[PDB]
Amino acid sequence: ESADLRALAKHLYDSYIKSFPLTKAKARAILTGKTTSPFVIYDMNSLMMVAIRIFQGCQFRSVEAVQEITEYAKSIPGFVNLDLNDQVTLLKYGVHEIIYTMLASLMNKDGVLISEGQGFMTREFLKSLRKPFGDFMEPKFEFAVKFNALELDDSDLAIFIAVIILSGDRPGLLNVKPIEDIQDNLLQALELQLKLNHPESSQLFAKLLQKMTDLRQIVTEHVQLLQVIKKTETSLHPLLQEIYKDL
């Protein structure tokens, strides 16, 4: 213990560096201009240089991200030993929550990096898209500004998204006992990592744990928002289709 909790934190950090193209450390340096500059999209004209266009182009990276999160999951110790049915359940209910955590790293009060940092879409432009598309991103922006004020780094985020994947209360899970015993161990790694990485923030663990329920409700409110589109807006990628069905 403890020495082994630190080994697991390093293992997850390594895996996370290997699976995801844009770290929070790079994204922040791009957002602050400290890097040695992305194209800025603020209207239709700067985009082509419409809400459906954004909406469908967003599916592109989303499909790729489910693949990256799935690979990161397969590296979580114990994960590939679980019943393969429960592996599907954890990824089905976790991928969107992980997208929104990683999306926060690419966000500030004023907009969001896109295409691995080669672009910056402004919050004003997103909020100005025709209803109901204009409201899709605002709940993500208000969660991102609160979550970024915790000031986690990638080494913290590696264990945090592992904790999100291994949730024992997902619907349909066949055998929760082995899932819960991995998460308890990851929660222990996260608690210790935050003590080491932020010895000054007394209750950062407690603050962080409460964000996990915030994510769950962004996904709930997103899904309800997307049902209206499908009803009133006449495509979706089959892998997004398979994740959203009965979700």
């Binding site: 489910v66 393969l84 049915n85 599907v88 089905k92 349909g172 398979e242």
Partner: peptide, 14 residues
Amino acid sequence: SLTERHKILHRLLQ
């Protein structure tokens, strides 16, 4: 049946 109702996801896991 989870792996049968999620063929793309199931294949990304194998």
